[model samples]
Target chain A: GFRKMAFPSGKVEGCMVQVTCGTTTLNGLWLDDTVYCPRHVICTAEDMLNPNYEDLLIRKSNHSFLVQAGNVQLRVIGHSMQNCLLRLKVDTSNPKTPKYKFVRIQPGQTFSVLACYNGSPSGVYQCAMRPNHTIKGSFLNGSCGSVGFNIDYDCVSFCYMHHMELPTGVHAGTDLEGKFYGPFVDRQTAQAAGTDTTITLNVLAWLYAAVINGDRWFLNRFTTTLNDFNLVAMKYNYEPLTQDHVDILGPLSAQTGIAVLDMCAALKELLQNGMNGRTILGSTILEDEFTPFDVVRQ
Target chain B: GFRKMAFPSGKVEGCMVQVTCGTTTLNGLWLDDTVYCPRHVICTAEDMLNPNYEDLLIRKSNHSFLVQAGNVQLRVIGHSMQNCLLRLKVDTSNPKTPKYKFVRIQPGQTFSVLACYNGSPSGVYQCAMRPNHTIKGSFLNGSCGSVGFNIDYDCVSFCYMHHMELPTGVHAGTDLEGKFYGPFVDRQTAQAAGTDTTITLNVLAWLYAAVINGDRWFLNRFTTTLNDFNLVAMKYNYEPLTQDHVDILGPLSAQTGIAVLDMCAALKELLQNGMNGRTILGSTILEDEFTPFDVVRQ
Candidate 1:
């Protein structure tokens, strides 16, 4: 049996929000004024604005906007434009500009903005508000209009959602909430070795806690748990944490509890028994789990 | 000091004729109505006819024709059109066409002829007569317009000429006269193994005779002689005749001499000592010896 469900006008609770309508999937971040999907579609707040404002009679005060899903249209309401702009300003802060000023974007209009950090322009973000629209953003690594820096949140969220389902005894909001939006790790270095020491330490700490609690479900699904971790590594283009990495994170884990060394040993034993070669997570699983966002983007 | 010389009207003798004009080289065969070169240029007899008959006033009875070399023009004094046609008819004879007839090719005109052998159309030989003309020929292996059958005389004669200069104590006219015009061997088979048994046997007989005479010069240049034989192999795309092949050709060699076994042993010994690897004869040697025939085709 197959069923079709829709989640329209979904509010972004934490840092992330995902919406699904029929076969189309969408993703949005609370910190950014953009919505995207796994297929690399970036839709900004301006992109969602109704072009025929006179016909739709959409008030300027109302934050509701239209998102196309084939012939069907879905409305995304309650987006805070000011908050999003403030987040963007904080993220791309420069010493030269203590107070940043941005022009208000209206329906059926266009605006261009630069992502500047440390007195250097890092990216150019352009958006055109219309009845049906798409995002136009490009990153500049060193100088303006150079190398690209894109956040594939769909790829990240897919892994994150998978990690949440695992019996790791780690609560999302309390244990590993603030650690998600830390500094970006170098993809090449991460893929070849492991992620930054800070990220690895946090993950190790969670595993140690799970082992100390004697989580029966976690022990039963140990192999699946290890695979989930490897999936995260693959999604982030980082190497899976090995026994050697666990040993290195031992001192950091000990800070939480005195029995941390014993927990680390127990976790290492489980990993050694369960984990074989790395699991290569493919796009097929993503397709099965969620529909393509191409329809909405189009 | 390099000097430029030209051989304008070279007659085809004993199925082979080569003409050199400055840097341009050409080849003509007695049996075929086509003259060609190493670089695959085939110029038919009709292609040599003068375009401006009113200006030149060249008699129809005259066998003489013009050949171009750069800006300079040279006249070929003697070419028997009837003899050439008769030779073609003899070569491509069929039971039905007991009386073979062909249309006379006039100046500034084109004629297409089929190469039929045993009632099977083997090739299409086309010639267009003009002031500056080139030959167009395509082989038809079976049916009418199918596979190809080309005689690369430039490649053959090159090896033949080299064989003539060898101190193998075999005269070109007396020893291997009629043998040169024998049936064509499959190039792939010849390259992989050796040539037809008839051809290989003849070569073996010649080598046997050279050994029997106690040719001191041949013994001294034994390394070079073996290399020359290998060069023939590479040019014909045939494997170099091994000691086993020499043994196979032993009985054929004994027909001419009783001490053929002793000669085979000597040749095998020379091959074992001198022929370390097959010598790959390249186009570089051909370029150094004879100029390209591309100019005449142009």
Candidate 2:
């Protein structure tokens, strides 16, 4: 909305200062028969906080999801209406970071980027999809491509996170189309050689111990990761911030205010009731036998 | 190779401390038929300083490429041999870190994990391959699968360096299958959103300045990262410690003993003559336009 503005000189009568939200600018000042009013300040209030994507329907044709994690940001889009699932693949030079994300989007409906501050240096992750789905094609070592898009990231110092329709031209293997993910093991190669890829599913236990031991950095990182998924659920309207959700998330969001024992209890409660509980551990029976504090024994 | 043991007591026929390299144990010592001896020590010589995948091959089925970057460790393997081209995907969370590597492996022919410490976390990365090379199925978010061989990374705190076969998968678009990866820009999204994801392609420049700025942590971290790959090239017969590669890496492996400017110049020289030179930026014409000190000015 274009409007007029008084000069910065504070003069009552002046030629005029053209004021408008323009295209990119979120907020600004305008002279609308009132001087020094809050309306000018609150003009952009609808967006600055609690961004609503519903208003973006008019510009669906030009919408893209911007996911920012820490210092990294990923811009993802749907190439066409038929291809809407955004597959996030992970190349691990250093294995340990679980990378996978499958995002479902529509032609013009811009989706929100799930902000996980602790996922990848590229700020990307792998998302699994519905079973019986077979994706063809693969991304290059340091490059990515598709019908409408292609990207390259070769420099060791170069990092990227792109969200687009899953590329085509790949085949599917038996048992590859199922769901329910856990920490994957490199066991086949190990067994072929002779033994097995020594994998202990209890790795999570050790990590939990670190949190109880007052590892500040580790604790901070763990909590931030929790917040990452929380926002994701909220973005997709999967979980509302009910008192239960906040009960689990409140302590995690606070920096140095919660008691150690309380924090541990809160974490367990979250694991039992929060997103990870429902989607991850819960998917498997581990949720039934889950004991969050068991890590302290080791 | 379990052998007889004697008592540790200095009596006539005391219990001895037997020593043998078990399946995964680096070194072991139990009461054998001898007194205190250095032989009990340094028994795991081959693996202590330099890791030998040859020994693990006898236990081929037991191997998994263990990637350790900073504090995170990732152990991955192929789920099925029919889909043997185990393309290791990477998702860079941020820059100033090399986040690219694709190793294609076949059954029996053990693949290697090229070690590069600096890269984004999720560590989401895409793997490239041919059109007909359709890899079926997918890995669970946290659960990994496999078919051929697997590697072990049992030590939670220990790091690793393994260089081996590259995986197969996708093709490149616009960009060649070769290298010279830099930070890419999302102009469309930037324009659409009215803001851009601020990126510094030359984070190395700032880092080099940090080394010059006397930041001990940065220098130490940078050097350790340098060593991670140094061993990888050597491990997989990529960069030998020959006078040629040494000329580029020796000073980098040093501990506070090289000149800042000299090291910077040495790095450029390495880029011009080393692996990255022969494969990445050098393969392209950007090597000619690369300025070593351009980062210093920024």
Candidate 3:
């Protein structure tokens, strides 16, 4: 009787193999004529003291084997051969979000996954691999993992909304006034003729972040008032960024610790909820939050 | 007798005033209700050992003033008052090149000058304030200096040429072939139909530097072939960059040690010669020159 097994394509770098070694069945991940098992670890005091020890425990529990020659005979006696599948769990508080999903990585192989929503690639989501794991060497915001390593991609979505409006300047009654003195103005006759308009302020903020990341003068101007934001928005339209823009913004967000993307989402939420018709003021969108200036100061 | 002396506008930051103190005709630069005099320095072994000592001597010979309060009665004895005019000598070997000109900086004020050719601002010129001085608190390729500081704006122009062609790929007779295997191909039949194109490869290189300054992966792709250059050229047209672009690229050049603007000029010279028909190869335009990778390695 032939046992039928199916492996998903594009999930792992290698193929699966089942071998018979002296009356014992050995199943492992194979790549380039070699079978790989998780590297076994014997925990010590030093290992326990490591910051990544908890993650180490999880990975160790998942799979811990060694790479061996493809044709090497396994000793059948007193050997416990666990399944060679490495797991990548999407650890999110909400289980129903399909933006991230679990992966069963094959041993001796590498795996990379993306965060997407509604069949479109989204940057409003962040995914980080669990501690003590890396993808392609570095682990700033790991979206990939490999054989003998289990990854828990802790992902979160942010700034969900329709296009929103941000004030360029304040208003009193029907009279269009000047820039706001605070981050938000009191909702009264703040909406003046041609003064209030709709725009994605989040994307505008992100663009401001990108531009200011290269030139701090822009940041200085931004710190003055939201009028500069309006000027930047007018000069450069805020649409979904190109891949090149995203690549730069991603690292910039990391380096600045401003989380411009996440901040933009929060800003949108704040603007939509009763903050509309209120003149947006200040250099920052989020109230009492650490700004790009704070990051620079640090 | 009142002397009619005209001062240039927008050249310096402050208004001029002359004050006569005691029996000595003390001519000095005045600003903010205060007169300034040079702070004299005596040359020592330590001062001579300084890398900036030569510039120090020039500055010392010129004006090295100290701030003096307004209406201070001066003791005129043993004091030799020089002219209050601080000269910013345009120290270039070529005297006739009007791209750079001498400036007379009034002491107690700041002065900044632009480099232009034929009434248009050009980036093909580089100017450095002579050693051991700062403009706006930092001293990397300074273009501005303040009172008691007689600056030598040592400027040099580079890469003079009309627009030129660069091969995207090599050709044999009329057939458009692939990218050049070397930095340049043989002149015979190397200009392939449709493979040869005209572009400001220097600006392209500069843009490449700008984009890659933010992302190094583009540099990796660039090192493989000139096709990447062609692609980047196709994607982003090179024209006179904006002030914002120059602001970023200026520091980028200092940080990466890649004079992309100057290198572009050399590349143009290399390409415009008999090499016009030759296929441009490799990652760099200059022969025996360091690539962006070399900078990264360092």
Candidate 4:
């Protein structure tokens, strides 16, 4: 026996939908337990400013998800009561780029999805979870409501740089608070770094940013054309950084190969590019505040 | 062929050595073509001392050198006018331990040497350039008149940590300045890091000292059981750090995995050992002034 039945604007007619409630546990984008739901946000088109209509809304949601991206791939996981719509984008300007798709999820089920693409992972990428039924509104015509994550890859995934968090009392101090300059490798960057000379430069860039503020003297002592010895000797006479000759310097010297000269050149380039996310804080190597003079070491 | 050739108390009869001086000159353990040796000594010898005794030291020398050490191997290089005597020690307790050696160099010739052994390089190693003749004094009888670079490696290769030097103006800032935390690889640590589960914990140690104060929250957001959510959620509730799932995080994740839990455990250990140069300024992690509620991010 079939009967003609209609549901709310954003509600599906044939599917039974139920909002998540109760707290066994949960965090971030997903529930920590099968029985507990973490959080939910109510989105109502009404009581909102600049609204053309009042259809986009959410009565409740048991659905939630987490977003992570890298290497032109986006991975998402969440708890949902039904197979839902997922939208993703790594490089947005190009059409047919987001690789839109539907993921089937059983009721009260948790699922994960990985979307791969041909683009730079260190670029802006966004994702969202669509509502029960489609609505004509902000996210999409037929989108009821959603939640998602965004990554600004320019600063090496900075928005999610929670690993670099500070501890208790040392906040608001003059010490460099949020500096992360290091060649962060995934398996690929790590493997490629073995022979890829470019990787060393990238790693060097990270090091340059990490220490540029507090340790300029150390860098100058090893490789500075404007060395203090030149000031005293009245000549270009200088000593070389012979770390390679030292057995202990082993892989570091081998990997970097006394990059003082190359480093200087790169530093200059970095300095020139140090604006609007062009380089690592637009650092100036020997000619700037980063490099200081020690009576003997510099 | 020769009348009895008597010599000065500090001079050798046959070696025939002399101090150096010239328009193109130098000083410190090395040089200053103009007139400066970049480094200075503020050694407060707990006993008797005089200004003249201090002035009698290297007013200036053209000699200079770089320092490197590992597994008992100590490498040094510098300027010398004659093939002079060099004294070095890795550990003082044993005779055959330090693996003492001599090198012959031309007058005014610059040269380098590497001494290898069985112990870790992170201990004290002493060096000296003995005078042309031996004197019956402190470094002489016991071995007195001499000059050279000396290192107490017990606290890492500190004397040679050139890249970690602070500028003159910021020398004494409250901010913990001039600190570097890196494994500094030979091929072993390098390749091993790609697969070693324990290495990330080690790497984490280096990072703790590097920026525990200002960036703790960043770290927690990525991976920390003791995160703010833990404080509020009364759970090990934590934000997902999607970095590992990223493509670039590949080998890195494979190598060290997500280290948030291990980092928290290690942090506690570091706190226990956080004194007498054990850790960077002996950071007080979660309990310090570093951790703060992320009013915006959360």
Tens-place lDDT digits, model 3, residues A183-219: 3222322222232222242233333444443433222
Whose TM-score is higher: candidate 1's or candidate 4's?
A: 4
lDDT of 1 at A283: 9
RMSD of 3: 27.5
lDDT of 3 at A181: 18
Error of 3 at B249 (Å): 1.3
Quick one: how many clashes does candidate 1 have? 3
DockQ of each: 0.00, 0.01, 0.01, 0.01
Weakest ten-residue segment in model 2 chain A by summed lDDT: A1-10
> Which docking category, incorrect, acceptable, medium or high, applies to candidate 4?
incorrect
lDDT of 2 by residue, A29-54 (tens): 11122111111111243453343333
lDDT of 4 by residue, B127-187 (tens): 1111111111111010011121111211111121111111121110000111111221111
Q: Quote the positional error of residue A274 for candidate 3 in Å.
A: 64
In candidate 2, chain A reaches a TM of: 0.15
**lDDT (Cα, 0-100) at A290 in candidate 4:** 15
Flag regions of model 1 displaced more than 4 Å. Answer: A1-298, B1-203, B214-252, B255-262, B273-298
Better model by lDDT: candidate 1 vs candidate 4: 1
> Which order, best to worst by lDDT?
1, 3, 2, 4
RMSD of each: 33.5, 27.4, 27.5, 30.4
